[PDB]
Design an enzyme around this catalytic site. Structure first.
Site: not given
Ligand SMILES: CSC[C@H](NC(=O)Cc1ccc(N)cc1)C(=O)N[C@@H](Cc1ccccc1)[C@H](O)C(=O)N1CSC(C)(C)[C@H]1C(=O)N[C@H]1c2ccccc2C[C@H]1O
Ligand SMILES: C[C@H](CCC(=O)NCCC[N+](C)(C)CCCS(=O)(=O)[O-])[C@H]1CC[C@H]2[C@@H]3[C@H](O)C[C@@H]4C[C@H](O)CC[C@]4(C)[C@H]3C[C@H](O)[C@]12C
Length: 328
Positions: A33, A213
């Site tokens: 990630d 990302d």
């Molecule tokens: C450092 S860490 C905290 C960070 N929080 C934050 O910034 C708080 C935040 C900031 C701005 C907004 N407006 C909302 C929340 C965070 O979580 N960042 C993630 C990237 C991100 C950032 C912001 C929004 C969405 C995603 C992380 O980099 C990431 O990629 N993740 C988390 S766990 C994970 C499985 C590896 C993956 C994930 O959730 N994927 C799912 C997903 C996600 C969005 C749309 C479809 C899907 C399906 C599936 O693919």
């Protein structure tokens, strides 16, 4: 001279790579990630159902384990994991270093993602100031230790039913891309975020924030922008979920065009449709989700990266983008 870690596709939605923690080379599968900056593995001390099927880390079996114990919680958008810090030797491909990581003991806040997928943990490839516990990024550390040529890594994503992929640490390999490689300067100190004008048909946002990302399996779009995109598009939202279904051959589906002074990147429907033949014949889901940031932002997730080879350069504070070769 570069460290190439093989990437495996999982159901055309995500991809994983393997790495090891501990001197006994305890093997784990990771989501890689670029949007986060902490490494974590589930512990043998885990108390929760999700850990049942995972490769679990046993600090008692590693002579390079250094106890830390500081409590920590990782709050992702898809849920929370908690545990405590530990330090041990982390091996990524053919390179190793002592490294601080989180031993996770509770994964209940990360359901149903965790139990539905086959990864053990998350390996962050972000910037130091996004980490908890001030952890230098793996790639930055490997460069600092002179184990690699450059503080950069690249992603050549696998393609379901065509080829595996690679995370390459330390340099850019020609074999992964075709046509020009175009560098886009970071517009933020600690995200892999660049400025691009975003065009989808007649709808456009000038100088949008775009986050490349690797851990996000969608293109994310601002909600107003999405709502305009969907108007008379003949797409149907799934009850209770923010996903849209379409006929796969829907001639209205648009092409994303992202432009800079330097480059032009497009994303045609073939790159953002997921076939769902099981739900219905000739139906697809859009891998596009509405999401508002404080500043209008797109996430250029997995679907973008499947088409485009990407270079994440810490030293030059840029993202490099080129068309991925369809075959190795
Ligand atoms: C450092 S860490 C905290 C960070 N929080 C934050 O910034 C708080 C935040 C900031 C701005 C907004 N407006 C909302 C929340 C965070 O979580 N960042 C993630 C990237 C991100 C950032 C912001 C929004 C969405 C995603 C992380 O980099 C990431 O990629 N993740 C988390 S766990 C994970 C499985 C590896 C993956 C994930 O959730 N994927 C799912 C997903 C996600 C969005 C749309 C479809 C899907 C399906 C599936 O693919
Ligand atoms: C990141 C966005 C926006 C979330 C948001 O931020 N919405 C409320 C405010 C947040 N807080 C509660 C933290 C603040 C306090 C409330 S307050 O009212 O004070 O603002 C949310 C909204 C819908 C969410 C997806 C769907 O679920 C489907 C799916 C479920 C899986 O499981 C995980 C993956 C996936 C794709 C989800 C990812 C992500 O998770 C999404 C995009």
């Amino acid at each position: 001279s570069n460290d190439n870690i093989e990437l495996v596709d999982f159901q055309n939605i995500m991809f994983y790579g393997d790495a090891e923690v501990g001197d006994n080379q305890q093997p784990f599968t990771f989501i890689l990630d670029t949007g986060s900056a902490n490494l974590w593995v589930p512990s043998v001390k885990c108390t929760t159902a999700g850990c049942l099927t995972k490769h679990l880390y046993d600090s008692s079996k590693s002579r390079t384990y250094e106890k830390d114990g500081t409590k920590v919680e990782m709050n992702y958008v898809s849920g929370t994991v908690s545990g405590f810090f530990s330090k041990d030797l982390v091996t990524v491909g053919n390179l190793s270093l002592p490294y601080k990581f989180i031993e996770v003991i509770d994964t209940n806040g990360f359901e149903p993602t965790y139990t539905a997928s086959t990864f053990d943990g998350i390996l962050g490839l972000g910037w130091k100031d996004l980490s908890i516990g001030s952890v230098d990024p793996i790639v930055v550390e490997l460069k600092n230790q002179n184990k690699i040529e450059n503080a950069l890594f690249t992603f050549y994503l696998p393609v379901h039913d065509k080829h595996t992929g690679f995370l390459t640490i330390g340099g850019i390999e020609e074999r992964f891309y075709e046509g020009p490689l175009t560098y886009e300067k970071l517009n933020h100190d600690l995200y892999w975020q660049i400025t691009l004008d975003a065009h989808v048909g007649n709808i456009m946002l000038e100088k949008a924030n775009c986050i490349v990302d690797s851990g996000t399996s969608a293109i994310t779009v601002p909600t107003d922008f999405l709502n305009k995109m969907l108007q008379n598009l003949d797409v149907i939202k799934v009850p209770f979920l923010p996903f849209y279904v379409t006929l796969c051959n829907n001639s209205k589906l648009p092409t994303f065009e992202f432009t800079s002074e330097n480059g032009k990147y497009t994303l045609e429907p073939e790159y953002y449709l997921q076939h769902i033949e099981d739900v219905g014949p000739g139906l697809c889901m859009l891998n596009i989700i509405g999401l508002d940031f404080p500043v209008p932002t797109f996430i250029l997730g997995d679907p973008f990266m499947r088409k485009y080879f990407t270079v994440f350069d810490y030293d030059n504070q840029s993202v490099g983008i080129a068309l991925a070769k369809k075959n190795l």
